[PDB]
């Protein structure tokens with residue numbers, strides 16, 4: 001039932017998913033002046049050299065690029081994390097206009113889009129078990145701004161024509177996610193949730209300070225995707241973002257001063 005329209009969007013989610021009103025929901029606004037530098041944070045380690053991508057899917061809500069998580073090939077360690085977290089998929093949230101689209105906000109500023117690299121804790125054995133745990137996932141969030149083109153994103157935009165409508169998938173091998181990262185690994189971190197149903201409170205969020213830049217032509221191709229299935233009235237896949245949720249009893253920590 002759920003989606004991003006007037007009759008099924010974020011303000012309706014709580015009827016099927018009561019945790020939508022919970023104590024550690026995501027996204028949030030990051031107030032930069034209230035966030036605390038934490039000297040206890042250890043350095044962040046992104047090890048993506050052996051990543052194995054498999055394919056790309058339009059699921060009616062976004063598109064997902066899916067990875068082989070049957071071994072430690074692409075992992076996230078360090079920072080706030082205890083242990084090893086395996087890369088399972090990435091996806092994006094974006095807007096109808098360049099001034100909206102991100103899920104997290106920085107001093108109330110919305111970016112054009114947000115990339116989520118989703119990782120699960122190998123102590124739990126599989127992704128479905130990990131989402132039932134408070135420390136089961138680590139999501140690396142990266143903001144996108146419209147300016148220069150991102151060469152490492154072009155291969156993704158090149159394949160979107162083949163997955164226009166809900167339920168379509170395609171082969172997507174040999175894509176290197178290192179090409180989606182900014183120069184700096186400086187970050188904010190806090191405990192939160194999945195940003196789509198089932199909204200489970202299982203995520204350690206790691207949100208990079210430095211946005212990546214993409215071109216207008218790249219973001220326009222995201223906005224050509226469809227929420228509907230093939231043969232149905234067209235509904236463009238835009239504004240598939242959940243707004244900021246109450247911070248409640250949480251503190252956001254910074255890795256940098």
Ligand SMILES: [Zn+2]
Nearest residue numbers: 091093116195
């Ligand atoms: Zn997401």
